[model samples]
Each structure stands twice: as C-alpha cells, then as structure tokens.
Target: SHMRGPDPTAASLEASAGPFTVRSFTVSRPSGYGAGTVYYPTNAGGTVGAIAIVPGYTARQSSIKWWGPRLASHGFVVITIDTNSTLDQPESRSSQQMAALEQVASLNGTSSSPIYGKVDTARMGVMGWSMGGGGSLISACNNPSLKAAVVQAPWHSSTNFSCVTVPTLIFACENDSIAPVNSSALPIYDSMSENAKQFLEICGGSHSCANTGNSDQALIGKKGVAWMKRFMDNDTRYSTFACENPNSTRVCDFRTANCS
Candidate 1:
C-alpha cells in the first residue's frame, strides 16, 4: 500500500544542535525507482551541509521520517531517498540511490550540483537500513563526497568492507535473524579499513525493530539521529549521547571504539 503525507514543506523544531528548516521534495530518477521524496533541512539562506539516507529492503522514505527531522533540527540538510523497486537487484538499487544523490547535488548547483551551492558537500554523510545499509557503505567507499556512514542491520554478505575508509556506525539487533548480528554485522566490522571509526550497538529487538513502532525502535531511531548530528552536523557534544551516556535508558548496550 503506497502511503502519502502532507505537502512537502519545511517545519521548525527545537533542536539542541542548532536552528534549521526541514522540507520534503521528490526527485525523479530516469531508471531505478520512480519519483522518491527527498527530505532536507536548510539554514535561513538555504545554505548548509547535506546527508543522503537510503532506506532498507521493503521500506520507503517514511521509514526514516524520524531521522529527517532530527538532522534538520541539527541545522544539517538531509535527504532520504526511496531507492529503486524494493525487489530490484541490490547492485542496481545501489546505483539508483547514488544517482539520485548526484542528481540532487547537481540541481542544487553545488560543485556536486544539488548539494553544490545549497549544501556543504564536503561534510556530506550517508545512512541506510538493511540492504540500503550495505549500499550506503558501498557508496561511501567509492564517493569522496561522503564523509561518514551509518549502517543499520546491513545485509553484509553483498559486499566487502575493507575499502570503507569513512567513519562508520553499525546498528545491530540481538534478535535479528534476517541479518544475524554475529554473521553479518560483526564480520563487516572486522573487515573495515583501519581508518574507519566503527561502533556497534546491540538493541534488544528484532530486525524489524529498527524500522518503526517496535518496542526498542525509538531507541534505535534516537541513536541513529544522534550519530548523524554528532558526525554529520559537527556537534561533538552529542557524541556521548550517541555513543555513551547510559543514563539515557533509550539504548540497551551502546559500545564505542575506533578502528585502527
């Protein structure tokens, strides 16, 4: 069932990172998926950093709704795209998602286009779930424009992690059988390049829990939002909120370590 929401517009939120505006718009890709919504935040003059989010398998842009506002609240312009058909091959889907970001950067007139003048493309980040999670890593490894990446229960077997040099975060679930923590996530973490900053958080939920409404979904959502703010938006204070600070109670077991 295709879900619809209000007309794409910017909204204001009380964000600790900084003040910004959030809006949603659609980018039509020639191949891959059809029209997919791109949610971004902008400063008063519409100039700021940008992030691209790729949704997981069988998921849409709305699945990451909580993230768009959180990043926007932090004064960073973020875009979450609905990749090609969820059923499409993983490689093809990744290409489409990457193209969508390039298209948006071009339209925005940045050296990168959509993000050129509109966003601080140099500080760009990427986040994805499941299949999209792996795709995000692949994109980050190959695209110098991507400075950081967050992989949520990524489908790890699809690619290699040795070339991923950007700072990375892997959100895993103990109860996830779709992409088991031990076999999928841990292996990818072990294979990442020495320069990568990797952290693995084990939530007390299932694979679907990372999506929405699940018992621990809020925690996952909050953590993901916090990571983007800390690294992507340059809010170093949120690092504790994202990696440590057990008092929050939103996370079960949050671990922090840098790859060497």
Candidate 2:
C-alpha cells in the first residue's frame, strides 16, 4: 500500500501550522565541510528524507536557515550549513554538500543524536541560492543518488549538466543582478537530461528572493516542499503542485516537462 499524501486543503499546506513541533541541533565536525544547523519534526511516524542546503557566495548559514524550519516542519529533515571556506566555488560547494549528506547518513540510527532514527538516507536532496545554486545543480549531476534538487537564481559557469537524472526545481528571480536569468537559471533548465524538471521565475525579485525571509514564501515555499515530497517520497499525489502552477498567474511564471 502507498503512503497517504499531504492534505491539499489543510492549513499546514496553507498558512496553518505544520503537523509537528520542530526541534534543532548544531553540528561542528572536523571534516572539510563546515558547521551545520539541523532541524527536524518531533512527531515521527516514519523515517523522512533529508535535504542539504548551502548559501551563495560570501553567505553563511543564516541566509538559508529558514529552510531548516520550513521544511522540517513539513515532515522532512533539513540541514543548512556553512562552507569550510567562504567564497568557495560551485564545484567545491558541491563536494561540501555531498559530504554533509554523508554525515547525515552516518548519524542515522546513532543513539547520540536527536535525528538518530529520523533520517531516510535512501532519499536525499540538495539546494542553494546563487553560487550555492550552481553547487546544488552540480551536486545533483554528480550524485545520481540524490532524489531532488532546487536552485534559486543560480550562477553556473556552464549549462552542460546533461547527466543529471534527478528531478530539479529552478527558482529564478528575473531581476537578479548577480545571476541573471538569461545566462544562469534558464540555461540550466534547458540543459537537463529529460528527467523531471521545472523552472519558476519571479517577475521582479532579486537573488535572495527565494531565501528564508522571502516575501513570496507562500507560493515558493509550498513549491519547494512539494518538489521534495514528490520526488524524495515518490508520492505522485503532489504531482499537481510539482507540475502545475497555482490559480493566480502574472506574478510568477512556471514551466515543466515529464512532470506528474
């Protein structure tokens, strides 16, 4: 039997509170990857997926910390991290992201951690903004094991990620000065290898428009959770959301292929 999907009309999916009360912890390992702040829901009926997040150039964990609570509250474990070194390029950040996921897998079933038995290591995701967005794309391409990926206003040097098989969600800000949509986000979406992929571009947002404190969280946040749930949990019920746009349009633009 398949697992039940989230309630579309539920307040949780809307502005209501999520089903679980969230808890958090910090991890500072000696590995090449930097520190991390993990968030997880306390109500655990079954193991949930985990997502590793990184920040853009010169950014630290704070920029993306909102994802930890937002996603964790929705029943997934999330880790927002700092890079071993600031200003690390996409390739290096990709390595750091995968390394963080590896550490999360290692913590599974361990008695010493709060998320000990919470993580479903078999399902994983990666995400980021700007330079970190490019790193997320690289991570998905390099790690076929990842189930999903989300990049916000990404800035990648090339658009040749034809090897990526994971379903990817690209959140582009049309007004981003740093990672312009023409050369960055749009090209990355066009280069995907026929695997499920989507592109959502905001009309007049900036690079950080999709971040934690973003004003468009109502739409963007739901999409992020839906994409992760649809792919990581293999729950096709979220397909309508993973593929189609909400009722109101002109404010945002969306496109997808092989979705649902």
Candidate 3:
C-alpha cells in the first residue's frame, strides 16, 4: 500500500479552513432517500469516492454534520442526511444508506447534477454515529461490494456480523454509557474476518466523542479519513496512517489486522 493523492504524506489535504472552495446544495429527490445536503470538492481533478453518512437514533443530520465539509474538501463527496423518520431502526437506516448510494450513482450521467462524473460511484463508503453506527455495520455487512466503513460508538441488537467482508473500522469510547465498547464495538470487530479491520477506543471519551465538538476529533477524524481513502479508493498511500498507530496517539487502545 502506498500514497494515492498527489502528496508526500497525506500532506496539504485541504491545507487550510477554506482552501478547496467547496460547494454545498440540498437534494430532495431519489424517491426513497428523501432529502439531504451534498458537499463536494470543486477543485478535484477527476472522480473521487462518495460517502453516505447518517446520524444516530432520534438525531438529525446536524449531529454528525461536520463530516460534510471536512470530507468533501478533501477530495471526496460526502452526503449527511436525515432519516425519513427520526425514530427509524438500525435496519431502516441501512436501507436508506443504500438508497442514498443509488441516488448518488444516478447523478453520474445527469449533467444537471453538480457532481456529475465527479463521483466514483463504484467506490463507496458508509459511516454514522450511535445506533446509526449499528446501521453502518449493517450496510457494510449486507453489501460486500462497499469499499469501507466507519462506525462510531455503535449500539445494536446483535454483534454476529461474521459475513462482513468490507474493510471496517470501529471507533469506541472507553467510558461510553450508551453503548459500552466491551459489549458493542468490540464484538462487532471480533465477528468480522481478518481482512483489514480496526478498533480504536478513546480514553475517557464519552458516547458523543466522535460527534461535533469532540475533543478527540483531531485524532479520530484523521484516522477515519485515512481509513476511508485507503480502502475506498484503494490508495495505499494511507497505509501508515491506517495501519500504524504512533505511540503519541491519545486513544486508550488501537487494534488492527491486514490494514497494510
């Protein structure tokens, strides 16, 4: 695995707050997925991977909205959406994510869509927070064609995700009361095969540690982006960031296999 972007070491990726001049829009079509905000990189030279992200149970898109700008500015397309119904279950969220992907793919040939030809529809990823994280796992496991996934502080009924073949990264909080790492995130990680899986537990982080205003976002966010880019785009350039954890990392625990 090696670097994919035109950089020395994941360098200058959205170097500043507004370097990429990202464009934002609201989309309410695609029949099944309803409405969502789309963020894309205007300066990117060619097609890039697209990501479908959702918030947790009883939550709105704003809960995990930061990813829209952060990911879109870094040479990818990011869509942060609200559930058709706020109280939808994890399985429903999974179905919505697939609909979002299909909607994203449809834009490829439509000249009216701002992201036409800009999205690498074939290379896709999914992520979410809390119960939505459980949906993220469901989406990944059900669709083996997906390239990667990131689930933050997941909560689910079962951890029997043995068939998930996509590269998965499960983020956990050491002191999460809502969905304890021991019972939730770890079990999901354990159930997956050894084909590029990782789990990171933030020390003393709360259930919302991976959400907006999270102090550990600097660390967790970088890892998340690295994981997506490395696996989704098959850009080996992120091997070090995705596979090796520097001793200085603040997380309480980091485990991985086949990341490189």
Candidate 4:
C-alpha cells in the first residue's frame, strides 16, 4: 500500500536510470561519519525513504558512489559515505553507517538543508561493499527499526547474525577471494533465520563485482532498487521484481525466504 512510482517492468527496472529527477549535495558538516554525498529525487510525488551506503576496508566512497544516483532516481534519499578511516573495520563502519543515517534523518528537519521536509525519516535502509557490507548487517542488527538492508561482498569476522530482524538482501561475488561467499556471506546469510532474506551470487565475479566498477549494472541496479522498494516502502508493486529468481547467466546462485 505504500507503493510509489509507476508500475514496474523488466525494461523499466533494467534501464540505466529511473523516472524521477535527481539532485545531490555534499554534507557540509558530516555528523558521525567522515564525509557524505546525499542524492535525492527532487519530486518523488511524496516524502521518500532514506538509505545510507558505506565503503569497505581501505576503500573510499568512490567504491560505492554508483548507488547514490541510481537509488535516488528510483525514489530514495541515498547517502554514500566514506568511513572515518579508510582502513576501518566492519564494526567501525557499522557505527559510522548508522551515524550517517541519523544525519540524513536530521537533515530532513533542517530548513537550510536541501532534503528538508523531503524525507520520511521513519523509513530507512542500509547498503555497502565488503567490510562496509558487513557493517550494513551490523547496522540492521543493532537497529531493528531500519526497514531494509542490501549489501555486497560483505566481509565480517563473525558468521552469526541471528540477531538481525530487518529484511536483508545480500549480493555475493562467486569468485571473491577477499570474502568468499561460502565462509562469509553464506554463513552470515544462514544465520539470519528469523527474517526475510535473499542472496544473489554474481557468476565468476570478484570482490568488486557488485561494487561501483561492476559490469552488470543493469541487473544489479534492478535488484537493489527492487529490494529497497519492496521492503522500505512496503511496496508490493515490486514483489515480482524483488522476489523472483533472475536465473540469469550472470547469477551463479540465488536464494530467498519470506519474499513475495
């Protein structure tokens, strides 16, 4: 019932861009993270949900920046961030990710901010790459109020995320060496036994496969947006797009629970 935007189609979701016009602003006073870039739809027809994305160990926002405009154009307030230290681990990234979301929520009430009155702070999501992806999971665990989460090549030390109750979608790189799917993503995915979850493995992909430099932008973009839309906005209009297995040559493995 919270559905926004026009009805979706494969072509529409697969397009390089979406229906809304997007604008961005650099965070002048970064709240709890190092720095941030907020991308938002100028007129999404109503207040939209916000999402925060963080980068991995030794990585910067450039590694996850592609998601900002892509998600914002699809009717979200997307904030991509750089950690306080590029080498910060997943735990630190988690704290910063939550902090980033908080700042975004705060900006919604600041009249001088570009996103003032443009966000429904009650609904929010999280995303990231590698360790930052691990951070996304931690953020979900620590803050169940978050509506949804989507991460890529997440690298976390712990495999047990049984505490996470928020809906989550994990993008795994089949050939990843840094955070092998079997030991990292898979175990983490398996641990979340009490929530809606999905895992999409990119065939023959590397750690960066689902990050900014991936060659499968169209498909990945569709899935990421659909996941956020389906859960964050409770938009069943995206049920098919968010739940169906792509069965694509680009996907090596796919799994889902409580979707549809």
TM-score for each predicted model, relative to the true structure: 0.77, 0.94, 0.92, 0.98
How close is each model in CA RMSD to the real structure? 7.2, 1.8, 2.3, 0.8
Residue 90 displacement in candidate 3 (angstroms)? 0.8
State the C-alpha lDDT per candidate.
0.61, 0.81, 0.80, 0.92
Q: Taking the tens digit of each residue's C-alpha lDDT, what string does model 3 give over 133-252? A: 888888987888899998899878998888778898888999999898888788888988846899999888889888876776557667787788778878777777778674535689
Q: Candidate 2: worst 10 consecutive residues by lDDT?
A: 1-10
lDDT of 4 at 87: 91
lDDT, residue 87, candidate 2? 81
Model 2 clashes, total count: 0
Candidate 4 C-alpha lDDT tens digits along 1-260: 56679989989988888899999999999988899999999989999999999998899999999999999999999999999999998899999998998999899999999999999999999999998998999899989999999999998889999998999999999999999889988999999988999999999998999878689999999999999999999998899999999868999999999887
Best candidate, lDDT:
4
| Model 3 C-alpha lDDT versus the unseen true structure | 0.80
- lDDT value for candidate 1? 0.61
Worst 10 residues of 1 by lDDT: 1-10
Off by over 4 Å in 4: none
Best by TM-score: 4
Candidate 2: Cα lDDT at 185: 76
After superposing all C-alphas onto the true structure, candidate 4 shows an RMSD in angstroms of 0.8
Give residue 178's error in model 1 in angstroms: 0.4
Cα lDDT tens digits, model 1, 117-216, are: 6665556777777887888788877775575787788885644688887778887777788888778877777777654355555556577555544455
Scored against the true structure, residue 98 in model 1 reaches a CA lDDT of 72
| Pairs clashing within candidate 2 | none
On lDDT, the stronger of 1 and 4 is 4
